[PDB]
Amino acid sequence: QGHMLRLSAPGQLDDDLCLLGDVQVPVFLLRLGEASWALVEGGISRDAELVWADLCRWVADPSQVHYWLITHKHYDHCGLLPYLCPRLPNVQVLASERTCQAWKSESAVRVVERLNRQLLRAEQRLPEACAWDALPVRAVADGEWLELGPRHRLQVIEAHGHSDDHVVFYDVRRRRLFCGDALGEFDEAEGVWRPLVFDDMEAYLESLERLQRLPTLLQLIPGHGGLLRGRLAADGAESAYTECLRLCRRLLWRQSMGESLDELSEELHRAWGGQSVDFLPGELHLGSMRRMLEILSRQALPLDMRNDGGFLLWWDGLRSEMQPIHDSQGVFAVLEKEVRRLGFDYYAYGVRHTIPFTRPKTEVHGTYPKAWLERYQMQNYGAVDPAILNGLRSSEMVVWSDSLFDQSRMLWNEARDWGLCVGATLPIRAPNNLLSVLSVARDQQNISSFEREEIRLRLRCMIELLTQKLTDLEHPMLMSNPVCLSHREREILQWTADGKSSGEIAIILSISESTVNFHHKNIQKKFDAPNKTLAAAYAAALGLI
Amino acid sequence: MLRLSAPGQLDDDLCLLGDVQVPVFLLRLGEASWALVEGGISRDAELVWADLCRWVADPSQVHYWLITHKHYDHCGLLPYLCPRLPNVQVLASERTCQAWKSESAVRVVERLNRQLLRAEQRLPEACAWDALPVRAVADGEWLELGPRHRLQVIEAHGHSDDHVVFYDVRRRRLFCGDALGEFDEAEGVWRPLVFDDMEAYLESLERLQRLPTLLQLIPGHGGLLRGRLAADGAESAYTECLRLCRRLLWRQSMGESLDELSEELHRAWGGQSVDFLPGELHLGSMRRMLEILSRQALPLDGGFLLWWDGLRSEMQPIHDSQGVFAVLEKEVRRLGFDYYAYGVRHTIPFTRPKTEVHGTYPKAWLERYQMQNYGAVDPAILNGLRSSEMVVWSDSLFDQSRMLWNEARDWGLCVGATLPIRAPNNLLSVLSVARDQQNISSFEREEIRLRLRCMIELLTQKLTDLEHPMLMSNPVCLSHREREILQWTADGKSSGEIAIILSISESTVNFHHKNIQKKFDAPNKTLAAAYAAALGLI
Ligand SMILES: O=C(CCCOc1cccc(Br)c1)N[C@H]1CCSC1=O
Ligand SMILES: O=C(CCCOc1cccc(Br)c1)N[C@H]1CCSC1=O
Ligand SMILES: [Fe+3]
Ligand SMILES: [Fe+3]
Ligand SMILES: [Fe+3]
Ligand SMILES: [Fe+3]
């Protein structure tokens, strides 16, 4: 440990972690147990004999290395594999499907080897290498839990943007993130991030957005520059997002004055290239500056779908995404997409009708575990569910909390058993006396106050738009009871619900009492009602009069 | 172009006078009424004056002069051009007016302004600093400058302990002085200018992010910004200030002195302000800002959301309804409208449903409205019975009730909108906003719609929490037994079936029916059931 904020020296960094080789292109070593080890980041080819040396100072046996984690495919994060895997018999390489496929293409591996060979020292000779498609690889998927060791459980997270394959690794026990290049190149002289967007900007920014939601970080480890800790590593993701949008503002401003991509590429190179001269030929750095300046000019918002440039932008984008939809399932799909973008796992949408007064129908549709739907409806938990009933009394969102469920212990216990441990519920009353409710749920993160206030707005807008579209599509869940009254029957009922008898209506409307009672009979027939009272009460409850 | 930076007209009501580096802004309030903004530097006195005589036929028509803060580069012209504007009121923050009474502050200003003359110019006649025709303004004060110029004052301490900014709500135009910083003409980003307090600087930028989306942003240096640059101005300035904070903290964690980064910043920034700032004061101000930042920066080991947080914080502590309505007025005028209304439509009597209203239209039109019971057949209110979408006022909407629309137009209520919401007790509450001369432009429409939705939600919540009478409904209370009996009767059950299900006698049940009727002043069971359903009681 130290009082420093950046640890950037070969050797030990934490009670389970070591930096091997050159701090510029480090390889990280994890002690999963007494005789079990793992590696992280693949570094560059030319360090093969350096890295090896350092490794043998900590590990008594290379056969005890069982796993090697690789963020992405670029030549500077997989160059050591072909040379050191022939020495690590028990190792599995772990990479994203795209990465494992990239190692099978002759073209990509040829690029990798050309760039890695450009990096040898004076009269350097390379030790024997094995085929790229001969590596002992096992592909991983987004969200997969890697049970490396008893105290090393790491989650895979897709972080496309930097490249079309990039992934990062979250050690949740120590709140430690291996982020590779997805945040960029850390400026060692200023303390800010240098964006590295080399495939897609929307995906880059959406990835940084999804990463801002992780628990507060204590340790942040990019592919270059060592390990960051404290505040520097806690607000890392937000800081990378900020610096990317700052470069966007710079580029767009310069282009509004008439500058070319190459011009700002040369300007940026002048002030940045100096850091990566040891492992990156200057011309590839300039070309990457030009490439990223290409993408930014393509996808950045000018200065005049759902995304990044302010809230109103997300609002209009959501609306525009929902206009062409003529199929309800797609409506629900878009809603799900935005719910996940908020940071939750499941959601639900419920409608509470006002009748029958003894047992008011409460219909539900969502994406909770189907078995929970079976149990919920089977035991009709939906009658006195606090999340829905709060809407009868308040227009505020209700964040799920033990105190709120004091009256309904069984429901809360069973929902907790199904993973629905954290969530929130917003209510809104449609203009037809209906109680519509929108709930969101996740597994392990409690709603922080700030995110609570954020949610309230985003969910309000989503549910407000959703009910509108479902009314335009006449969904069966909302259709309640399709009853249309004629103008005459409606005003007859308007009088009757005010207490008038057949005779008084006959007088007032200037028609006969027989006509009025026949109208009453028709009205009854529509409501499937046995008398006038049920018709009047349901019509009042349904807003028809 | 995206940045307008040339002397002369900038908009149909605005002109830039003098040097774009230290500009002075001119507003045409009317045919023979004008106003100024920014006090510039002394040495431009004869330049600016020239340009002024190109636009104003008579110098007596200049009636107001607005001053952001006391720095020498925003008040230097006053002693020299106020002697030429007989009818002008200077408008400034109290601290500024006090600074003008202290001999020391005026001496600093005078020395720094003298440093900037050319070896040729002679000084034109000048008046004393404590003799100026000054009028103090207050944070939030409404300045009814002109028929189409209603500007609000906003306190923006931080850059200096007195800084204030001015917001034209009609044009969504903000004069911000230096509270956001010095706009980088070569890069398009903000350079922080923190010369008094960092917390106040950042809180000022926060309060400014809460304004409606900006179309025109006018700092003390560099001209007028439009488009995206003006929308996220406050957000970007906030961000760049925190970026400088982290740069400083990192360098200090490596063992650098402030002098090092101060000289760096001078080398890379001072060139912009060489014409109006002696280089050594630029280095010293960089050092001052880096000192303040090093003092207050946190050690180590989106505008809409801000508006929302601010409104809530403003409306929770209030426990008296009149103040609630007052806050509503504040935000409505801040958006750019003149009057508002809040209405409640009860569901009964079904033939003559009570429609109560509270707002700020001319009392005579309310007399007229109720006199002709316009609340029954007002289309803006009736749209809420079938839709939760906002309604922009339009002839098609009012084709059905032409008389009401014609008379409302006669009173100036020519442009407006109305939002509907359903309180949790089956009441239809609606919120309207209105002005006279400007049509609702497309982008501001959706921004408005959203803000109105939020405001009315919180309003109905708070007034229910305050137990207002207009929301109060017919006071009838039932117990579980009689309530459940009514739940059964409203489901179509007869007296006998109810008695069977509840395990009591039928005489008991019909006597219960009488109980229920007595409260509603109802003649039979049907009226009771319908009113109970309409009131949400069963
Ligand atoms: O969100 C709601 C109201 C609607 C429930 O929607 C559901 C319930 C089960 C299956 C499905 Br699909 C949707 N209630 C919360 C309370 C805590 S658990 C829960 O469902
Ligand atoms: O805003 C409403 C509803 C009426 C509420 O306004 C009023 C009416 C009387 C006194 C007061 Br205060 C406010 N209607 C619109 C329709 C077009 S003009 C108009 O006022
Ligand atoms: Fe990379
Ligand atoms: Fe890299
Ligand atoms: Fe200033
Ligand atoms: Fe200034």
Residue numbers in the entry:
A (entry chain A): -2 to 301, 332 to 572
B (entry chain B): 1 to 301, 336 to 572
What does the paper say about this structure?
The majority of traits controlled by rhl transcription factor RhlR depend on PqsE, a dispensable thioesterase in Pseudomonas Quinolone Signal (PQS) biosynthesis that interferes with RhlR through an enigmatic mechanism likely involving direct interaction of both proteins. Here we show that PqsE and RhlR form a 2:2 protein complex that, together with RhlR agonist N-butanoyl-L-homoserine lactone (C4-HSL), solubilizes RhlR and thereby renders the otherwise insoluble transcription factor active. PqsE is a thioesterase that triggers transcription of the RhlR regulon through a hitherto cryptic mechanism, which we identify here as involving a significant chaperone-like component that enhances the stability of RhlR via protein complex formation. In common with many other gram-negative bacteria, two QS circuits use N-acyl-L-homoserine lactones (HSLs) as autoinducers, namely N-(3-oxododecanoyl)-L-HSL (3-oxo-C12-HSL) and N-butanoyl-L-HSL (C4-HSL), which are produced by autoinducer synthases LasI and RhlI and activate the LuxR-type transcription factors LasR and RhlR, respectively.
